[PDB]
């Protein structure tokens, strides 16, 4: 299979290893109690949290003493969140393990070096969102993504479009081993009998443009939300073939192992940015 090494980054169950819609793939101890915690290894481009029935953006700092505020780290002294890329690099100037890091990886590490509730003996590391609007890293105090039985749900929105949801486990080489941009004139397929064949079982949903297809794939993507139980480990409807000519979004839950050179298709993943195309 000549596509093995190129298609490795679309093996989401391996290169990500956790839920995408809802990432709660690990547990950690904080003052005795065990809590759930995002643990995906790839950035989730275009992901945010919608505060159902609220005009408060989810990157607003949490209520400092619930409806009033959002999910972000409250103001502190010195200020840790939000922190610009220039501020982060200067803050960790003397740290050797930051010099070759990138803006997204640095944000995840910076969020991960924050102590949870005065328990220094805890592997609980807060998630974060990096905003390319102004190159600011927002540490997230609330690491929950969905509550719609204060009601909120995750999604991809035109407003969440410069965001990137970052677990504590984002790899410093996400640039090579993770999906970011969608593929022009390419369709996901399965290598069968020495030739790339179509995906055998997909669900076709109308989608006016690429953004809607990516939003759908995200909604059906792997979800660790309660219904080590309720951990997807990256399994789900994470992939999508978007037919630009027919405006059809073809979603499936099997890892693709090759690409079909079709000029009417754009290949997308739940992790991928909803708009960017190579």
């Amino acid at each position, epitope marked *: 299979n000549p596509w093995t090494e190129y298609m490795a980054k679309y093996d989401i169950e391996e290169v990500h290893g956790s839920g995408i819609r809802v990432d709660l793939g690990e547990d950690a101890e904080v003052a005795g109690t065990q809590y759930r915690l995002p643990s995906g290894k790839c950035p989730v481009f275009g992901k945010g949290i919608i505060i159902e029935n609220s005009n408060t953006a989810f990157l607003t700092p949490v209520a400092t003493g619930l409806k009033d505020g959002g999910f972000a780290f409250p103001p502190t002294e010195p200020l840790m969140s939000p922190m610009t890329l220039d501020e982060m690099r200067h803050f960790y100037k003397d740290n050797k393990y930051v010099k070759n890091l990138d803006e997204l990886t640095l944000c995840s590490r910076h969020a991960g070096n924050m102590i949870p509730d005065n328990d220094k003996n805890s592997n609980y590391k807060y998630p974060a969102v990096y905003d390319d*609007k102004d190159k600011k890293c927002h540490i997230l105090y609330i690491a929950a993504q969905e509550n719609n039985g204060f009601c909120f749900r995750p999604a991809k929105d035109i407003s969440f479009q410069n965001y990137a949801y970052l677990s504590k486990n984002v790899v410093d080489n996400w640039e090579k081993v993770c999906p970011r941009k969608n593929l022009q004139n390419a369709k996901f397929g399965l290598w069968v009998d020495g030739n790339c064949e179509d995906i055998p079982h997909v669900n076709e949903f109308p989608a006016i443009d690429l953004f809607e297809c990516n939003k759908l794939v995200f909604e059906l993507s792997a979800s660790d939300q309660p219904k080590d139980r309720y951990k997807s480990h990256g399994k789900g409807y994470n992939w999508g073939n978007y037919n630009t000519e027919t405006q059809k979004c073809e979603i499936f839950n099997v890892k693709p192992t090759c690409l079909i050179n079709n000029a009417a298709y754009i290949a997308t993943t739940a992790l991928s940015h909803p708009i960017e*195309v190579e």
Partner: antibody, heavy 129, light 108 residues
Framework: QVQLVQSGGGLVKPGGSLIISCEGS????????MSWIRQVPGKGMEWVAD????????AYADSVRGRFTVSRDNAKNSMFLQMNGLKVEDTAVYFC??????????????????????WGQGQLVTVSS | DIQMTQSPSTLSASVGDRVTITCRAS??????LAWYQQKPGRAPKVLIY???DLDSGVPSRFSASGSGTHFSLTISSLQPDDFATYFC?????????FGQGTKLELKR
């Protein structure tokens, strides 16, 4: 602190070529999209060209495409604008901008449009025989 | 090709006054508008990005709003330093286009 220092401005006869420089300090030069913007003296601003962080992709205004070439050498913390076949209509003050603010997307070009947060001091380029 | 139209081109006002600078686009630019201040002979200084966000260090008297085709920069209580030229930039599409500018000047 963040500084953008330019050099290379001068007088060029029409049809000639000139290279303008933009050297950045106080930050990692490789982290930022960048812009070239010219201000026709007395008039308003006019965008010239953009270059991505890695330098892979470039964007140019219609009035300069094919004549100007933007490039960057992140190892030297430097960006360049190669102007060829200059016209008198190019006479203006050329600024370089550090593009921290990301905005809209351009398909199929694969380049985002940006707004600068820091500007260079400007260099006056005069084209006249 | 988006044409930014900035009005008024000249605005005279006294210290302590509120002024607004309107900048409008021929077609939607969503929220990708930035405001700048330029003193004569000096490089521009960024004031606003995303049409409503202040850069660090900008005084709180500066503020801005807008979306789509309607944008406005407001200075609540002018100080002697604020008198300068202001221009908007649109970074939703290429080509990036600017406003021709507004010269704010003191009234004695």
């Amino acid at each position: 602190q963040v500084q953008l220092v330019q050099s290379g401005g001068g007088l060029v006869k029409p049809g000639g070529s000139l290279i303008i420089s933009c050297e950045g300090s106080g930050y990692r030069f490789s982290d930022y999209h960048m812009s070239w913007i010219r201000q026709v003296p007395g008039k308003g601003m006019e965008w010239v060209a953009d270059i991505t962080t890695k330098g892979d992709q470039t964007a140019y205004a219609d009035s300069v495409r094919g004549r100007f070439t933007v490039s960057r050498d992140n190892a030297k913390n430097s960006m360049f604008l190669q102007m060829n076949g200059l016209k008198v209509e190019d006479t203006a003050v050329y600024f370089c901008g550090r593009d921290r603010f990301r905005g809209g997307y351009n398909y199929p070009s694969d380049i985002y449009s940006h707004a600068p947060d820091h500007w260079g001091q400007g260099q006056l380029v005069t084209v006249s025989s | 090709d988006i044409q930014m139209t900035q009005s008024p081109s000249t605005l005279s006002a006294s210290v302590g006054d509120r002024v607004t600078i309107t900048c409008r686009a021929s077609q939607t630019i969503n929220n990708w508008l930035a405001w700048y201040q330029q003193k004569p002979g000096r490089a521009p200084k960024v004031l606003i990005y995303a049409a409503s966000d202040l850069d660090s260090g900008v005084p709180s008297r500066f503020s801005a709003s807008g979306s789509g085709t309607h944008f406005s920069l407001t200075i609540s209580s002018l100080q002697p330093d604020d008198f300068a030229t202001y221009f908007c930039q649109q970074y939703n599409e290429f080509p990036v286009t600017f406003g021709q500018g507004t010269k704010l000047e003191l009234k004695r």
